[PDB]
């Protein structure tokens, strides 16, 4: 692990992938609020939470296996075995949030925002999740409102994903 | 891999918008709906599949499958020419 | 089994008229705003997939749709379901996902010709504006407009019988059979 | 009352043609600059909410809009209002928020076919430029352009009568019925 | 100038020839892909997308033009006589259009207007009136029958039943196809 | 009658197309660098206010702008000016602030449809680069590019007549009518 | 209460929340004009106006309930009860101003600035200013006040924002 | 008193402080006060910081909240005092400040680019440019023609008319 | 004295895209660090005056810049130079200050549309990092990024030809004309 | 040369040009760290190392030819011939550093600083560091030198600035 690796990863990511990476690491950097992804990775490395396996997990969550093979020289088997044997840096709740966000187009996100204006710009679903977290409306143990709102926009598949996560927590 | 990139570019340039929507529907499951919404060309989807390592010059199974589903063997011949 | 490729082939064997029929038969599950941009079968499937009504383990609604549009070739070729099966499956109560009121309407559209459609539009002059009675309007769109104007419904079939009696008698037979089934 | 969810369902049951009709019917309250980016029903509602013309305690304008576009199914299903009620509610003076001049115009747009619209555009050649008379324009946009060029209005119906008389008699009858309410 | 030759060949074809070619190409172009084909050239392009039409492979185009009895175009734009096509199609392998399809088309060649009325009246119990409208030719009836799984390569019973009630040469064509 | 409130209401009744028309009609007074960030009407007004062409005591240029874009409704409602008045005001020589060459051009843009614009852009292939001939460009931007390449002007109308003759004859009539006013 | 709490709050807030928090404490910090939020909190603590309840109210006004639960270990009901039992550090006028500002996009704020430029005297400053900055400018000119909201009410009515006019009217009725 | 001066110095903003220093450039003779606190101290020591002087200074920077909180005066009172008593800050400085407030960074940059010929730095305020021109004898209450023409060339005719109105106000 | 006013007027008639073109065409004389803060024409002019390539007695480089960006209107009105005069002056081999390689690159950027630019970016995936392939990158910035990686140059045109063959055929003609001019 | 010339040069330069001029004369520094450029020029004149040609070279390195002609009355050809025929006041290493610094935008400079922090450290907390400031920090840490450019080469390669690597290679080949 070095600065060259962080630079390569930062230069290989796009704006949306950077925004997603910032959201996934919200649970590990709760004190400081890193502005850019480079600062986030630097903070994680300084705090000893950015080993080769941690960066491998981060690249695996954004589904950038080309970077896993080119930069970190790792395949899916290595990252999956590391995640099986070592504790995860990003919780399953954040991965579920990101997955739900990836299965939503801008129209669905707009309709979802319109439903939740009673309880609470082209803002992404992850920004809405951050706003709900700041308002204590969504949490790994508090998904009922998001489930109902996804049901009301006729997105029963995402409701089923949330229910599968809830059953996986048991 | 510049010959592979020119393969992907020629295949993307030889597709219509309807074929692009068909490819978008076919790739749903490997690529999210949000990412598919931003795809404006076959090259974009091919590069997104390149990043996820579901597609590479060594393993062209996904490309051949997607292109055979679209019953377009004229570009399958381009793929096979690149394989040789 | 590539479920997406199989759905793609099924959509490739469907034209625009079958697509309009499927969209009409799926009105109870897909609203007007979500139905407007549906210009191919695939997109339609996507909407169903978003409502958990179409998946690799749930083909009931797809088979029902293909059976109601009389596309038994697709049922036997791509879904491995024969004509008799879909009948028994739909004869068991509860198991029908498309309402009997909807199917009936579609069946009326099966027994109306072009001149009969013109006479239908002429019979609905006082109830529907001319913009919705243009020559580029099929009978299903007229049914949709009637439903919008609360002139057609499961409990309001009066104007339907009135307009059908002026054209043909078998349509009244279909209407009466539907009424006799919903006792 | 999930007021936002009810509005969302009502908007989901509305297509682009009904949206254009609603936008035309709300011209007296929403200017052109604020109407240009309105590409879905929900947005429209927000504009009404900014003028207090749409709230959980004030559904009068929404009901009037849904009644004038002849969407009684939405009135009965999501707003719990039948056809007769609205009529009585709209017969009481003052309570009508959409002007009778606007409604009339929209009703004319209900009785014009495609060939009749082409004849309308051909009859309005000397008063409107070709850019606004192309085949992709509907009758409501023609009404808007005529209002812009002060040839159509609540007090100026002469050119409207002239072009309507050249095509059909029911349009002139609608115009005269609107005029009699004076 | 292969592209110009294809364009000229397509320009010399009317809408009826286009419908005949679209029916003869049903085994290779699905219904959704056939719907927007409103000219002959647009059909050829589809074949080019399936590698059945190129400057080095004119077999399928020549077979289509021969089955539609348009020998003038074969002689003028493709430099191919009737005997060449006879020899080419008598060999049991190079024929690309299935014998089941050709037979059907040939039946449509031997049916008059009153015989079409008799066919439509004979298929009342199996086909709805909407698909039996006066603008329906025999090929569309064949397509609808295939959709309703009453006509097929293994199901010719209803076809023989309706054909025997009208003419004997139609049943003769059916039996000739069956014996092959 | 608050001048700022009146200007705000006038701007709220203007869409993006009217804004582009006003920006084109004010090209002789606002340069390209100052015109680029203008994304609403009010901004435009401010520029005029910086050149003393728009104040509570000087509405001549604003009225001329609103008249040339055929927005007589705003002239009568917010400026208390009828259609005939402006005409006389613009018939007196010298008092016209928008050049007759500019107005002419805009009027040509009023008589060009979408297919006619595509034919115009296809007709200007050898003279203008592809980057400036993209499908996202209206006829006024083509006029601006032509003026930049000194192929269009008040004294250079040859290519304009050549391309207009390839599409329509009334455009040549407008060009010749403008030419006779010289 | 300690320095760690102030540090956590200052580092956990974003730019908009910081700018809002500085505006809300304008009525209690009159003797100093704090540049950053940390200096504001230090001044409030030194002057005895930053107890645990005061910081809880400050976090509740910026709608940062996650910080209320993580740092101060409080829910919404507890902070509301504290506001019921004790006088408020932030007046209802500042909360109303912030509420109006949150319901205004850049276009609405720009149109509102254009309507008021006659009474301002402010020149041609092109820096996109927030509604709270506009309120600060109006306060510097003695044009808006808890007992002087008629100009803001009329200008919000003229930009077709009747809901914010109703917020102002309800605030006036609560007095 | 000193508490009042401290409150005023702490209550002012950076732009307001710079404007106050520029307006008091003519009254602080022989000295160049760096901060506003030093300027106010010099004015008090020299006997030029009465209640009316501080009221005029706060009114020129359009800081009426300090006029109401500190000096307990409305805008009407300060305006009447300015009508009845001679001004501490001349109308020329007020005109300069008004022109500077009506100029964006781009306009100031273009004005500096036009005037760089008559004065053989980046991010300079309009008041800094006016100070530079005054030190070079390019602008003065009786010498505004060059500034007028330069404002005309940046298509700022409103400021040119402001200058003309000042010239008419001189007689 | 008037020279500065003329420079200011020329700069006011220049947009942001023309400004980017001017910055690209002057890359061989102004490095990237000094070019990054150039957000107005006057600043570019200042830099040129600091390198004595722009003075009241030396307008050659300014005229060449304005001619290569096809801004002949400013050349004729503010610099008193016609198109033919400039052609003749630039046909002499010594007088050209902007390299033909730069002009060629700029013309390629002039003959690439938006979808063609997207295909260009997709064709340069293995050679340029993704961060530099954002949708806000114009073709000139991509040329600069290639030059940084010594992939583009007066002697290295292979990848340029490859991507141009991947998009359009006229670009290879421009490249071959530049190469045959040598 | 004279004091009026030094004063004119000091008054005509901007902050960045002043910083660059201070960096170029770092090798000639007579056991002193001059803060101001006027002081540096005065020291060079007193030490007999600021002739007309030396100041001409200094103005030529900062690419200020307008000052070269107005103050010293020279063109580019004259100073180039003087540099060809006479030994240089500023070594080729400083000129290479300045050229590399001029070919780097803020993003490249930030990425270069981010790469150097492993070998160097965070250094000055200021986030507005020039390339020349980074070179000075590396020189103070014995990380870059006219005979030690491998680290700079690698760091420029990692930020995809192969043209600057080629500049460094050309400098290495010229020695
Ligand atoms: Se005082």
Author numbering:
A (entry chain K): 1 to 120, 127 to 176
B (entry chain L): 1 to 84
C (entry chain D): 1 to 183
D (entry chain C), F (entry chain B), I (entry chain A): 1 to 182
E (entry chain E): 2 to 181
G (entry chain I), J (entry chain H): 1 to 175
H (entry chain G): 2 to 121, 126 to 176
Please give me the paper's original passages concerning this structure.
In this work, we present the crystal and cryo-EM structures of ternary FADD-Casp-8-cFLIP DED complexes, unveiling FADD-FADD, FADD-Casp-8, FADD-cFLIP, Casp-8-cFLIP, and cFLIP-cFLIP DED assemblies in a complex. The atomic coordinates depict how FADDDED and Casp-8tDED could assemble a helical 1:5 and 3:3 intermediate complexes, and how these FADD-Casp-8 intermediate complexes are targeted and capped by four cFLIPtDED molecules. The resultant helical Casp-8tDED-cFLIPtDED hetero-double layer appears to locally activate Casp-8.
We successfully reconstituted the ternary complex FADDFuL_H9G-Casp-8tDED_F122G/L123G-cFLIPtDED_H7G complex, henceforth referred to as the FAFuL_H9G-C8FGLG-CFH7G complex. Subsequently, we obtained the protein crystals and determined the crystal structure at 3.1 Å resolution using the MR-SAD method, in which FADD DD is not visible. In the 1:5:4 FAFuL_H9G-C8FGLG-CFH7G complex structure, three Casp-8tDED molecules C8c, C8d, and C8a provide, respectively, a type Ia, a type IIa, and a type IIIa surfaces, while FADDDED molecule FAl provides a type IIa and a type IIIa surfaces to complete the CBS to recruit cFLIPtDED_H7G molecule CFk.
